[PDB]
Amino acid sequence: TLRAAVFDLDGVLALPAVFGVLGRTEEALALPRGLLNDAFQKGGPEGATTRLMKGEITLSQWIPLMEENCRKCSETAKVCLPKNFSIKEIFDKAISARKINRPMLQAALMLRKKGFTTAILTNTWLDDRAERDGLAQLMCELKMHFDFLIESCQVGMVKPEPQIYKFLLDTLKASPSEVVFLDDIGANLKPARDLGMVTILVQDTDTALKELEKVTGIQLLNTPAPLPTSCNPSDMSHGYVTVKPRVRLHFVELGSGPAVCLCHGFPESWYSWRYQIPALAQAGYRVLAMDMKGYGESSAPPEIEEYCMEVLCKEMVTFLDKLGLSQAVFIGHDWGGMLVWYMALFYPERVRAVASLNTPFIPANPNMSPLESIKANPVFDYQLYFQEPGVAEAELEQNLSRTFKSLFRASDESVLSMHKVCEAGGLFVNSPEEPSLSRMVTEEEIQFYVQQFKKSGFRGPLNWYRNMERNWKWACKSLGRKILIPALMVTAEKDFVLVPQMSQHMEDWIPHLKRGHIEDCGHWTQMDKPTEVNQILIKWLDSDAR
Amino acid sequence: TLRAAVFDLDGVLALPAVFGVLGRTEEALALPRGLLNDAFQKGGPEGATTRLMKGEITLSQWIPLMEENCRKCSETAKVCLPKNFSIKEIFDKAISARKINRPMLQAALMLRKKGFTTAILTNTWLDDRAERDGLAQLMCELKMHFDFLIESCQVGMVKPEPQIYKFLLDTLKASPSEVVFLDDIGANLKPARDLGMVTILVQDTDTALKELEKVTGIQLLNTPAPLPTSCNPSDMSHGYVTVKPRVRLHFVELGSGPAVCLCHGFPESWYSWRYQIPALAQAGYRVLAMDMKGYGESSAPPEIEEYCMEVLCKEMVTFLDKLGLSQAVFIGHDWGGMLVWYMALFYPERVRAVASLNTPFIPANPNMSPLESIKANPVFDYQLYFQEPGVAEAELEQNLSRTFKSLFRASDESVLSMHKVCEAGGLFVNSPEEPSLSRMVTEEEIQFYVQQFKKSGFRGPLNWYRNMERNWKWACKSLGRKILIPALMVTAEKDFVLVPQMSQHMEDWIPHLKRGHIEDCGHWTQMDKPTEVNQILIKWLDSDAR
Ligand SMILES: O=C(NCCC(c1ccccc1)c1ccccc1)n1cccc1
Ligand SMILES: O=C(NCCC(c1ccccc1)c1ccccc1)n1cccc1
């Protein structure tokens, strides 16, 4: 029966409430009890604050009106306002102190996941202070988790006027008995309750959440920690840069601040960074998640030599030039991580900082070709199978759903063996035709990769493996160099191909290298342990790349 | 006969040269003459500096090798190096002091315009210092003006080795007698001269430019000030954001730093900001030049109500939300400027700063509809002609080349009269069928707009004029507000429609408003006076929006 939940911003989704700060200011300044809250409410529906909440005036126009209300109130109370009394300082500090009430937001996110329509109905103002960006950032973080955001100053109505509740019900397309309304002010609950809405008076979050649990029949308190916020591809800004006549690179962009370039591995997409993109934008970074050459909406020329590391690195530099970026932080995973180490060795002036997930920096051996080094490790046998053009493309393109279901699995769910792939005649020869869905991915996420690989296939992606000799001769030019810019190596405990021990001698080449290690994490690092990846990257970016 | 010009970076395109700074350090530190230049060249082809210029080692690896060369040199000279002697401090200060030699760059730009292939051939290093961004920014600014950039550390060869000159001729596809080579080091001229190239020894820029004038037969010195750098659409990063199910906005993006949103007028394009986009990116801003709703690659829904200011402003806020931008500086011209004032009145928390070119802030009059106010000015008669759907679309779409040739003219070239458009039965009824090309625009620039308007026509653009009543009723909600965020009004002397005197009472509503005025500037401000617009915007952005 209940299908919508409406939350107030102040005192419910954001703590502390402004009224709580007015009460603390009177206690700190030895002012009469309720003096500031009386000045705030002065005039009722015809007062300065109602005009402010309705959007008739801005916050800066209201500030001297509130100051005058404070003096009028103090004159009747027979008291004197302190020497340096300022409404602006009081409100700036109050607005700045207000943070998201994470448990209340987790409950709203959980109700929305269970089919509820969620809305914020708040009495707010048009903020024109020099510090208005702090409020704008809070509103941006919150509004993405709600279906509707109704602000009094935009609709010209305020709570507790009965018209804003009628407006709310029309916006939600729901009848009052289908709506739960949460508010910290009892006067704002009264009109919702007259219409027949379920109301919860928020004094403390825990008791408010227990009432919300009891009335919705959904567990909100004591539930497990949720996964990070993910990307909806159709909600992303899509960018397209032509780096050379036939090569165009596609990227997805989110955030402002230092540029951070995300480089995916094989056989992946910009979508492989879906849990990182919102967290990294929220941390204060401009994230550019690439579709590498040969993938998704990026150009996929058929020629092998178009995917040698030298051409690939030169095109990433041109990509920076065309976007007008002198530097970017380069974060790679798998083949992307292989590329970001060579970006640091050949173009250090364009790389602000370098991070690799799973992929170690392995210097080229001038005494041995990479094809003879590949044969010396039985786990790299699938790389010899990928050499002959057409062979692996036929197997990997035959059934796209099966390809991504067999590959994208947690370490304990792996249904493939990378050794003796050549003798068996394929990657999937002793694997099920219909593999089960991994606990790591959903069916909708698997179909995104299927749709992406339906466009250009596996030729471009497989050509990254077909330049062993060209990459080796080019890497041999950097054997006298060291990586002396900020660098991070993240190892994944359960990656059986890119094993953590493959990274142990990296300090000889990158002496001030920072490390990260993720336990119980397989190859697909970003989607296997998203919270752990986000915390390791955000901490290193904040300290070494800012 | 001469068809290529090659310039060195150090001492030719960038001043001062590193060798000049080594000589000044010896004079300042009372060290023997030539001591630092001997340490620099120590070992010749087998020394640390040749290894650095060839890309064998990075700048940070070379620094302690140069320090050791300095001590070895001082021991034979029987002298002591000062207490705080540091190669890093000396090189950081030398690299940082180096600026673009504007006259030398203007000459290269002029030779390229006259059909010459231009190249930079430099002995440079892989810079991995914490301060390497300064060098990266210099290289980015320069490389866009040259056909080729050959760096010794990338090709493994150095000047004066004869192989780098053979490599240069193969890259240019030219024979030595067709090439002019400019260098400040005489030893680097010798091999170019042996091949038969024309060489110029650059001691001072003026004498070097007189030699270049005499040999090319092209005037380089004393020529007029050139127009700002323009945009090549195919070299731009193209962004696409879906703001609502059927509405997608297209933008072009360049730069890093605070976000700056450019909003064009009628009947224009993101391309109207072609002279501003590179200058603003170079000034340290992330420029987003929009194709407004109804134009170019942005969605053009047929419905009139899709272009009312309220819908338009809400979609620009959603545009910011989807890109993850809490704020942007909004700079508008014409209809774009009309929109940026309403972005400041309704969403001040999302607007970092607001600037309008030509368009004044005119508050809504609640006692008079905007249609009766339009009739009271004979110059706004074309707005009544634009009211009836289909009529103006038929005239403006009939001949696209004629439409843009008749509109895009300087104040003295205007071939149209905006008064009595209704009585005459059209904008072009007493105008030539083939108007001459204005001195402001080229034929290629006119064809860009023709190609853009061939897609969705004039319906969407004309619908901005068909919401007079809806815009008026919505603007009447902001009559009690003031604009209290940083604001700039730029007036154009010769705009006969959006006359400068229309802006005189703006201070009553925007009390701390900053002003700009451009003399001998008509309606098409950005392309009429691009250098003047760029300087007014960059100065205001640097002081009020940073
Ligand atoms: O082969 C490389 N990555 C693909 C590994 C992947 C894979 C192997 C074989 C086929 C497809 C995908 C994998 C999947 C699961 C577990 C470990 C590894 N690298 C080569 C140098 C840098 C990357
Ligand atoms: O009509 C508006 N701008 C178009 C002016 C333009 C023009 C007028 C008529 C047709 C096309 C283009 C013009 C061209 C040349 C000189 C002055 C003005 N505004 C309405 C409010 C804000 C903008």
Side-chain angles (χ1 to χ4, degrees), chain A residues 2 8 27 52 59 74 134 160 187 237 256 327 330 400 425 442 457 539:
Chain A
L2 283 172
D8 183 34
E27 278 186 355
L52 169 81
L59 198 61
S74 73
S237 178
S256 55
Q327 286 191 340
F330 279 86
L400 289 170
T442 73
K539 254 204 65 247

Side-chain angles (χ1 to χ4, degrees), chain B residues 265-268 333-339 358-360 379-380 382-383 386 396 403 406-409 414 416 418 421 427-428 458 462 465 468 494-498 502 522-524:
Chain B
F266 176 91
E268 299 187 63
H333 171 250
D334 189 76
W335 269 107
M338 183 75 111
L339 179 129
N358 303 40
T359 314
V379 79
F380 294 156
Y382 70 87
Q383 311 191 12
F386 288 175
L396 297 167
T403 291
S406 315
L407 289 170
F408 298 169
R409 321 193 59 85
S414 64
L416 303 177
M418 313 306 182
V421 161
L427 262 183
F428 309 127
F458 276 86
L462 284 168
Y465 290 93
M468 294 308 174
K494 319 276 202 72
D495 194 334
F496 61 91
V497 163
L498 302 184
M502 278 189 60
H523 182 70
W524 320 97

Side-chain angles (χ1 to χ4, degrees), chain A residues 55-58 60-61 125-128 132-133 135-137 140 143 153-154 234-242 251 253-256 286 317 321-327 345-353 477 480-482 484-486, chain B residues 55-58 60-61 125-128 132-133 135-137 140 143 153-154 234-242 251 253-256 286 317 321-327 345-353 477 480-482 484-486:
Chain A
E56 308 192 16
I57 61 175
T58 71
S60 297
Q61 297 178 274
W125 55 78
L126 299 167
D127 196 337
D128 57 346
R132 73 206 174 269
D133 195 41
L135 193 132
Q137 282 173 243
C140 287
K143 77 204 291 190
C153 62
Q154 292 298 161
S234 57
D235 277 346
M236 305 313 277
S237 178
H238 284 275
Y240 300 87
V241 181
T242 299
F251 66 99
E253 198 173 31
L254 189 66
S256 55
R286 176 187 171 184
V317 168
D321 295 338
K322 306 263 194 137
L323 269 164
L325 300 177
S326 58
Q327 286 191 340
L345 277 169
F346 286 80
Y347 307 97
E349 45 274 295
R350 314 304 304 270
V351 179
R352 173 65 187 93
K477 293 156 56 138
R481 311 179 194 159
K482 285 215 186 178
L484 305 163
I485 64 161
Chain B
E56 308 192 16
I57 61 175
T58 71
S60 297
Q61 297 178 274
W125 55 78
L126 299 167
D127 196 337
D128 57 346
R132 73 206 174 269
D133 195 41
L135 193 132
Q137 282 173 243
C140 287
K143 77 204 291 190
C153 62
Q154 292 298 161
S234 57
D235 277 346
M236 305 313 277
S237 178
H238 284 275
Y240 300 87
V241 181
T242 299
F251 66 99
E253 198 173 31
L254 189 66
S256 55
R286 176 187 171 184
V317 168
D321 295 339
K322 306 263 194 137
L323 269 164
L325 300 177
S326 58
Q327 286 191 340
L345 277 169
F346 286 80
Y347 307 97
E349 45 274 295
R350 314 304 304 270
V351 179
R352 173 65 187 93
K477 293 156 56 138
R481 311 179 194 159
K482 285 215 186 178
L484 305 163
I485 64 161

Side-chain angles (χ1 to χ4, degrees), chain B residues 293 301-309 311-312 386-390 393 459-460 462-468 470-471:
Chain B
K293 194 189 197 169
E303 309 81 18
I304 286 168
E305 52 278 352
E306 286 288 301
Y307 307 81
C308 67
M309 213 59 58
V311 165
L312 293 177
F386 288 175
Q387 294 307 304
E388 175 63 30
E393 284 94 327
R459 182 180 196 154
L462 284 168
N463 285 351
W464 286 61
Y465 290 93
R466 302 179 173 137
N467 293 272
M468 294 308 174
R470 280 179 210 87
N471 291 352

